[PDB]
Design an enzyme around this catalytic site. Sequence first.
Site, mmCIF file in Angstrom:
data_model
loop_
_atom_site.group_PDB
_atom_site.id
_atom_site.type_symbol
_atom_site.label_atom_id
_atom_site.label_comp_id
_atom_site.label_asym_id
_atom_site.label_seq_id
_atom_site.Cartn_x
_atom_site.Cartn_y
_atom_site.Cartn_z
ATOM 1 N N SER A 75 -33.801 24.109 37.364
ATOM 2 C CA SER A 75 -32.773 23.225 37.903
ATOM 3 C C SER A 75 -31.887 23.961 38.912
ATOM 4 O O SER A 75 -31.569 23.416 39.971
ATOM 5 C CB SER A 75 -31.946 22.601 36.764
ATOM 6 O OG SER A 75 -31.023 23.511 36.181
ATOM 7 N N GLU A 76 -31.488 25.199 38.604
ATOM 8 C CA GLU A 76 -30.584 25.937 39.488
ATOM 9 C C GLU A 76 -31.246 26.261 40.826
ATOM 10 O O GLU A 76 -30.605 26.174 41.878
ATOM 11 C CB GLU A 76 -30.136 27.215 38.793
ATOM 12 C CG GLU A 76 -28.813 27.869 39.272
ATOM 13 C CD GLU A 76 -27.587 26.911 39.299
ATOM 14 O OE1 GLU A 76 -26.781 26.995 40.265
ATOM 15 O OE2 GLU A 76 -27.509 26.019 38.407
ATOM 16 N N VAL A 77 -32.522 26.652 40.811
ATOM 17 C CA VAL A 77 -33.199 26.915 42.077
ATOM 18 C C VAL A 77 -33.306 25.632 42.878
ATOM 19 O O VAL A 77 -33.068 25.608 44.095
ATOM 20 C CB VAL A 77 -34.574 27.550 41.824
ATOM 21 C CG1 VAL A 77 -35.356 27.642 43.151
ATOM 22 C CG2 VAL A 77 -34.407 28.922 41.201
#
Length: 274
Positions: free
Chosen positions: A33-35
Amino acid sequence: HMAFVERVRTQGALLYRDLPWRNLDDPYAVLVSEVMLQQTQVVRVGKYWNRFMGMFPTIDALAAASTADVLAQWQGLGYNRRALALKRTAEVCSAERGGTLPATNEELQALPGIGPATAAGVMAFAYNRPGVYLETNVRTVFLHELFADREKVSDRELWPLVEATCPEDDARAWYYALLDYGAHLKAVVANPSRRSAHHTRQSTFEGSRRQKRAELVRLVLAEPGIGIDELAERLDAFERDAGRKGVDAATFTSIVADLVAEGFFRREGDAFFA
DNA sequence: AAGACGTGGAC
DNA sequence: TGTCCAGTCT
Ligand SMILES: [Cl-]
Ligand SMILES: [Mg+2]
Ligand SMILES: [Mg+2]
Ligand code: NA
Ligand code: NA
């Protein structure tokens, strides 16, 4: 008025967003999710994250996948180097870490695609460990709340304040509050990040080198084995169909050389394969 | 460091 | 309704 931490905590409670990747324990699902969120809106990531997790549910599964499948899953998110770096991180962790991500900030920053923000984000969101998580929403909150009258403020000046205000035992909930309050501020006042010293804008996308980069990768993904000259013909057809002129030979060959060097596809003879 | 690196959602 | 803008790497 209100002191800073209390403004953030109360706003965070008022504004809390129940996003699908929140309050997870799996560091890999959080990393994806963060990438995906890097320079990409939450609503777009919501259209890709569940699907990506379904096809590549683990570090080991992402490592084992073909690069072409990972690139196919990414198309539409933009900044496609992220897909290669995320997959490489999975391959490194699968071969070297028994299929797991590390659990220190420094070790995460050593992995491709993971800079300071993604590292702090994984530590805070997956492990509830404190750190300095400074992306566009956090930057906006700190500029708005603590640097209200400043024309330009560097991240260097913000860093110690982000560090000092992060709670020791509550980092996940704290940074969710900053994310949610920052996105709210970006809607209701003049974007505070315009007063960042690093505020910039990209060149025109139409006719740009990066527009051609993304097209070339899609053309090769769609046609394994496409010949080098056929690839140029298809790029020119796309450009003319979009109203632009043919791509000059130096630009075509330079972009293709870049894409091969970066790992988007390989050359076998004169043909290309993702 | 500055600047390369996609592209679709919100307004 | 065209403009703004949602981190990593060297
Ligand atoms: Cl350009
Ligand atoms: Mg890194
Ligand atoms: Mg644009
Ligand atoms: Na695969
Ligand atoms: Na605004």
